[PDB]
Amino acid sequence: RGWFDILDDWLKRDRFVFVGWSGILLFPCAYLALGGWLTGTTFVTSWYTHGLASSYLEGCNFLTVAVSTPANSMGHSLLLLWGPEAQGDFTRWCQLGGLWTFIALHGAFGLIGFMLRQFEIARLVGVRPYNAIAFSAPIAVFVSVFLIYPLGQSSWFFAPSFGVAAIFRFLLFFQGFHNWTLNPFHMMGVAGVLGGALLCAIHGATVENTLFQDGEGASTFRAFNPTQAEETYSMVTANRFWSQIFGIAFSNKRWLHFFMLFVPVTGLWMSAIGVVGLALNLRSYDFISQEIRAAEDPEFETFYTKNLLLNEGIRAWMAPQDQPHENFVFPEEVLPRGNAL
Amino acid sequence: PLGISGTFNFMIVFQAEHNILMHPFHQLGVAGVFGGALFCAMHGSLVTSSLIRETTETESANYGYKFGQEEETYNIVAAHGYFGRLIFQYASFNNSRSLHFFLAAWPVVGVWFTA
Amino acid sequence: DIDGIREPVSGSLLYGNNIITGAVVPSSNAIGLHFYPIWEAASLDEWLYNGGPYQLI
Amino acid sequence: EPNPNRQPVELNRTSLYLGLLLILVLALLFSSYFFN
Amino acid sequence: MEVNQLGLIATALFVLVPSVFLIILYVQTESQ
């Protein structure tokens, strides 16, 4: 019984909030990512990095506050508080974007700690760690979007900023510059997310509407005992219904619940891979055959050519304000516009 | 339009003329489908995590369930014991009917708002 | 001619589309919300030009 | 003197249908990008 | 349309090779 084993006993005590060894990584980092976001969206500006207001103190609301990315002139600096840019000056650190790397890096390590928590708790309780495994997709997404994507670009400036409307800007940037809707890795991601919502709703509704009558009340929730051995709904009747409604149905309860893990998890993983491509601007931007025909044939038009004209509008109308460090000056006469508008 | 790229054109022009991203019903639709995919994974992984040992390691664990069997193939008390400790005890369901009603309600209500 | 400005948009595989770009194109803006069944057209050729199939579908 | 570690492999008909569906739908998705 | 000529063989093998693999596994499962 050394000090290590005694520390291990106290870390793994059954308390209201389980701690564990993983808690030593998880709680400091999660609390500081959280607290850093709340601090920045309440009090901190984006004036010197972006030319934007971004806090409640400046008059923004919940939708328009953000902790914004640092200026493009910072490259991929860690922006340490004691590092060479801020030099330990907290006020200047805030003004230069230091809270962004602060949240992003503590957040990455917080996610690691949360997954380690899933492993730790599963092992103590004696269950398989499929839930830790499912959490790799959020991690894949976070790392690809917030770290890998800006590491391949010029600077952290182009990562997502931590805010509601800032993320909408990110969405629209990816349409106008990357044509990301056309990307098959995003299309698989879409299918996995909407298919997961579909599975979530169809499974819950099926169970609720094939329940056995295990009580006399009209609220059916009381007629379930968590220690009962018996299934609470009828797999046999659920199966017949969907077989005759839709043609096929699940028949294996284990395959069904494994499928529910698999579909959204695989979807996020595929979308992560497409974003790694966009780190290098390896877009699925065009279809070459369409461009060759369109360039030669002014009467050829498809929904693909129409969408590029939209992308061209997004780029030219949003770039001067969105990338102020470039000092884009576009005279009115070069802005692409259709008739009248 | 009835097409893949036509859908995208519809979405882009819609954002131009309605600022749908800044509309709370669409924001609720995103919570509906993100949430649905999250809870789909959660429920899938938690039931899978607590399957009862019924097979050897050279067979698919799926063969541990037989179509129409009376007993459950997973230990919901174990799943609750894991998930209650992952968050805290009362953030976790112990009533299968309440849990599955939640699974139905969240994405359905979310997509009502986006529609 | 989805937009009623005599600018036909090609939506079908045989007219130079692939799976990702192809579509059944919405009916002409000149039609608005008017009902446009096949039998209101002077010909199938007219019905096709103006986006009849979209309404039917 | 045969090897004791050999095992038969299995694919049931449902898994064939699922797997054939995955492949065909993946081909339908990527074929446009292959033709470009 | 001026498409990539190797796209036909790429698509063809993309379908054939994994499909044949599954069919092989399935038919030998049935015959045992």
């Binding site: - | - | 595989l13 | 249908y17 339908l28 | 349309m1």
Partner: peptide
């Protein structure tokens, strides 16, 4: 050739629908 390829793949999928439904492994109460 690309049109034929798209339609061929689509047609195989519809054929798969037919077998998946009408020639499934029947769910038996075991």
């Amino acid at each position: 050739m690309e049109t034929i390829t798209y339609v061929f793949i689509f047609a195989c999928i519809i054929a798969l629908f037919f077998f998946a439904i009408f020639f499934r492994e029947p769910p038996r109460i075991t």
